[PDB]
Short mmCIF file of C-alpha atoms in Angstrom, two decimals:
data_model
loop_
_atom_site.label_atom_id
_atom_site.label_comp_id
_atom_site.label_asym_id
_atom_site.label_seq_id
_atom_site.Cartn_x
_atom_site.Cartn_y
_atom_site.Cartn_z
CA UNK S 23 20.00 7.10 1.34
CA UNK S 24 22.10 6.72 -1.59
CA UNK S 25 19.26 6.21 -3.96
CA UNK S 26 16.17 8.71 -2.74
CA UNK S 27 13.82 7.80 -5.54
CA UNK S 28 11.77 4.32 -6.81
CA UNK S 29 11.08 5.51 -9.90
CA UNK S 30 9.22 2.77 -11.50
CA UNK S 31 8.58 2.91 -15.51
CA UNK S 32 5.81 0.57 -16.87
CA UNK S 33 2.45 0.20 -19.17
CA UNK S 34 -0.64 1.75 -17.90
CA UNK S 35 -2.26 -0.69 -15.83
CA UNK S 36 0.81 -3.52 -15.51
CA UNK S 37 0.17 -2.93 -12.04
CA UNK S 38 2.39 0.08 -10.81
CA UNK S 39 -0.54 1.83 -8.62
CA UNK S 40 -1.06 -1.65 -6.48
CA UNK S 41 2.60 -2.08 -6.53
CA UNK S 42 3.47 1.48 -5.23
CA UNK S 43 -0.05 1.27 -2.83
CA UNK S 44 1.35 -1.70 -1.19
CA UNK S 45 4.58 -0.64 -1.17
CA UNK S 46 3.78 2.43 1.49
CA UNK S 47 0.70 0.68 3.09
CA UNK S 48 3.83 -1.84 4.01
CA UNK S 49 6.18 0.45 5.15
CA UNK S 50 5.29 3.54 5.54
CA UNK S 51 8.21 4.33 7.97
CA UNK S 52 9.98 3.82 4.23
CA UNK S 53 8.44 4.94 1.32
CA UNK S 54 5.95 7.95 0.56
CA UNK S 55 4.56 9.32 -2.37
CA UNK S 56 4.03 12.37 -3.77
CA UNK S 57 0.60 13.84 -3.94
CA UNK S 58 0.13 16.49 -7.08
CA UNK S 59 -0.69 20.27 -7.01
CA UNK S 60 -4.11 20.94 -9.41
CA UNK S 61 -5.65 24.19 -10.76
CA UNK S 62 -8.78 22.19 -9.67
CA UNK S 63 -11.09 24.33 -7.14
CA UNK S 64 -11.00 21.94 -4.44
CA UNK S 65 -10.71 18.63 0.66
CA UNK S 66 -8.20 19.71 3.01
CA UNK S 67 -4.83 21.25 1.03
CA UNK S 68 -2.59 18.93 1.70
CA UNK S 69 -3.86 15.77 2.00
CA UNK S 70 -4.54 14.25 -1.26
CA UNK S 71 -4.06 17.40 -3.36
CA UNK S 72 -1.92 20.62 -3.21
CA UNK S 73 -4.45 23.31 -4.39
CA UNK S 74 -2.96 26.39 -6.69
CA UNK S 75 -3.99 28.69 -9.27
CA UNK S 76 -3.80 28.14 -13.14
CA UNK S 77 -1.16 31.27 -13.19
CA UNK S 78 0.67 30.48 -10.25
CA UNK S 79 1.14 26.65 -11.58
CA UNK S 80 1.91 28.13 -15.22
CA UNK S 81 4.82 30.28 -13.36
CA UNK S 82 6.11 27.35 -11.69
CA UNK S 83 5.94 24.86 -14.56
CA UNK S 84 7.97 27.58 -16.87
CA UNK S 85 10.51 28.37 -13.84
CA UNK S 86 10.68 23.83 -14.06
CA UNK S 87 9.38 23.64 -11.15
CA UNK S 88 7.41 20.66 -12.11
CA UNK S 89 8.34 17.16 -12.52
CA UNK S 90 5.05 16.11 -14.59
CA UNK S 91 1.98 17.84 -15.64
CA UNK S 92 -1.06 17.10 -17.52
CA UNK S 93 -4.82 18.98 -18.21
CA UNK S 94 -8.40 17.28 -17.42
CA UNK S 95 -11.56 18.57 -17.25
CA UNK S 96 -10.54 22.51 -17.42
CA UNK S 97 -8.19 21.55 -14.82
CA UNK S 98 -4.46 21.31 -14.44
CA UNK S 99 -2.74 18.32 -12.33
CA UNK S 100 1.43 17.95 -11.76
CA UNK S 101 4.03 16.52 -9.60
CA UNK S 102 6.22 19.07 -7.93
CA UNK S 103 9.64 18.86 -7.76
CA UNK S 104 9.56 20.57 -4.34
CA UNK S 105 6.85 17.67 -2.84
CA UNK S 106 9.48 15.26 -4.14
CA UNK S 107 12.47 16.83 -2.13
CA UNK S 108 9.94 17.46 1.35
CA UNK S 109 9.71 13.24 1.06
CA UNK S 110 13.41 13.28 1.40
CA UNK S 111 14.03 15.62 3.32
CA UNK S 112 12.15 13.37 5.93
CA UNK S 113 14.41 10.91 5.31
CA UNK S 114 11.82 8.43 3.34
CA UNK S 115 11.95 7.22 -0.07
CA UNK S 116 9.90 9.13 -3.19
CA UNK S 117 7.71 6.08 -4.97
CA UNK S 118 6.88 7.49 -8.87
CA UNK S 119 5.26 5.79 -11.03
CA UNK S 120 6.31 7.97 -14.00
CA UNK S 121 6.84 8.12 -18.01
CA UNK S 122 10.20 7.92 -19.21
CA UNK S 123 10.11 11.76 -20.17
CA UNK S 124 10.20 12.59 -16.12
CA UNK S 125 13.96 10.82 -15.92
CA UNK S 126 15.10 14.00 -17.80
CA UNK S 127 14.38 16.15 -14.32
CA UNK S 128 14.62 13.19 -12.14
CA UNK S 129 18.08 12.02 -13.54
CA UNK S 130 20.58 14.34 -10.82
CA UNK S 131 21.82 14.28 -7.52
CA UNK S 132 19.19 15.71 -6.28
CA UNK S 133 16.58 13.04 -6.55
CA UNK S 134 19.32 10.29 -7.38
CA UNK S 135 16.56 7.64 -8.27
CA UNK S 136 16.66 4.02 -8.67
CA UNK S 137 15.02 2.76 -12.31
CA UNK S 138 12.77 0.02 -12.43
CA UNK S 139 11.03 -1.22 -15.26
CA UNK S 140 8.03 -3.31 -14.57
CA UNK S 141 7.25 -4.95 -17.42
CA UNK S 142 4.04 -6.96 -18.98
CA UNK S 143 3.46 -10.59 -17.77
CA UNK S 144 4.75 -13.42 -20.14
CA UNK S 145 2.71 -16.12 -18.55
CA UNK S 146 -0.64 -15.17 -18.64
CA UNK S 147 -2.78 -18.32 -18.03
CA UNK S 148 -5.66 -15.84 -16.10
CA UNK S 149 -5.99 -13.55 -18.41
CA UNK S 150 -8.07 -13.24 -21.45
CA UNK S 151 -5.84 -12.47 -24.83
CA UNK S 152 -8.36 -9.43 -25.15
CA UNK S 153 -7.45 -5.45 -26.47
CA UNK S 154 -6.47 -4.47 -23.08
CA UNK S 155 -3.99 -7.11 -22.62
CA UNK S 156 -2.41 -6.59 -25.78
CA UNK S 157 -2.34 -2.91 -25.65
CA UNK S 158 -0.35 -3.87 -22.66
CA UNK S 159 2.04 -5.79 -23.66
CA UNK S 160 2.05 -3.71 -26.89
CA UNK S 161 3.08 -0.63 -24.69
CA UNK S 162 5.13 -2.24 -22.46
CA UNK S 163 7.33 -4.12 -25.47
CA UNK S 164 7.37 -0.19 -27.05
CA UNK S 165 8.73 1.64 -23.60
CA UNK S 166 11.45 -1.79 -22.83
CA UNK S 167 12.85 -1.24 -26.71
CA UNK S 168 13.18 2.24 -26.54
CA UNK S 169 13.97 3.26 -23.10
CA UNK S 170 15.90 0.27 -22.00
CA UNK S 171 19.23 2.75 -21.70
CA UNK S 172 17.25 4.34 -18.62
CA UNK S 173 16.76 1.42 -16.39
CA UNK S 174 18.40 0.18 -13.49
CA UNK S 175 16.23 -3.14 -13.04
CA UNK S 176 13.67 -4.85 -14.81
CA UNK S 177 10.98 -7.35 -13.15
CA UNK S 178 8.52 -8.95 -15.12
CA UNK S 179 5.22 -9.34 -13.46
CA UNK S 180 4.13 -12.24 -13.54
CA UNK S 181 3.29 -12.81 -9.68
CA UNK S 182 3.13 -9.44 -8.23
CA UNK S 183 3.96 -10.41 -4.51
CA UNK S 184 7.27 -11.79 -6.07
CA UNK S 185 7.59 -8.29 -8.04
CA UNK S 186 6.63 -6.73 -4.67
CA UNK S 187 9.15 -9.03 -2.67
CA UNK S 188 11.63 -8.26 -5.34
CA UNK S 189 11.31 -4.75 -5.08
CA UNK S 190 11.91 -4.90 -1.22
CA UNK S 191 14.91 -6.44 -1.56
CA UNK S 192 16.44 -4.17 -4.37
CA UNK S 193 15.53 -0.88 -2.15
CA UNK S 194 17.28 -2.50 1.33
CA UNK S 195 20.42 -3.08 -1.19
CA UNK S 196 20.64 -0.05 -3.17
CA UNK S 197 19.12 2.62 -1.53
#
């Protein structure tokens, strides 16, 4: 793989967790995701979290170990560089749906990701013109204006099988 990383950029909620969902349910033989490390007592270690301790994750996060990282609850959550590089090393392709901020780590060799903003729908007929949909497209119109240097491809989703089908084809070409 030339490209080892989908790294796809987007509002909350424009439909990156269906997108990325699908996209390994499909082919798993293909793409994998990364499952985070928490400071959260846990379950099985492994399998849907990596379990560590609040110093051992603070050590790691210093050293830049991590990708991404974020508190909740009393509890700690981040993507590890390392569980990034085990999906590769497997020969299968990292799926990240990521802020624009992660691109600083991601951006090298190393991961050598592929950029693709999915961006808010412009035909809408389905959905109501409520404060959810226009704190999407608010947030989406925000990260396409200011990050727009960082991105490889842009698909707006309007009909997210095409954005899926779309997606397909850009990974068989690039990656």
């Amino acid at each position: 793989h030339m490209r080892k990383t989908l790294v796809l950029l987007g509002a909350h909620g424009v439909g990156r967790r269906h997108i990325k969902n699908t996209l390994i349910t499909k082919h798993p033989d293909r793409f994998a995701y990364p499952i985070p490390h928490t400071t959260r007592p846990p379950e099985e270690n492994g399998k849907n979290y990596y379990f560590v301790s609040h110093d051992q994750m603070m050590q790691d996060i210093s050293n830049n170990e991590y990708l991404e990282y974020g508190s909740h609850e009393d509890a700690m959550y981040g993507t590890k560089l390392e569980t990034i590089r085990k999906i590769h090393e497997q020969g299968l392709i990292a799926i990240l749906d990521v802020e624009p901020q992660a691109l600083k780590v991601l951006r090298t060799a190393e991961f050598a990701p592929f950029v693709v903003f999915i961006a808010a729908p412009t035909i809408t007929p389905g959905l109501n013109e409520d404060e959810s949909l226009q704190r999407l497209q608010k947030e989406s119109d925000i990260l396409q204006r200011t990050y727009a240097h960082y991105f490889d491809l842009t698909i707006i989703n309007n009909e997210i099988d095409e954005t899926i089908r779309h997606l397909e084809e850009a990974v068989e070409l690039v990656c």
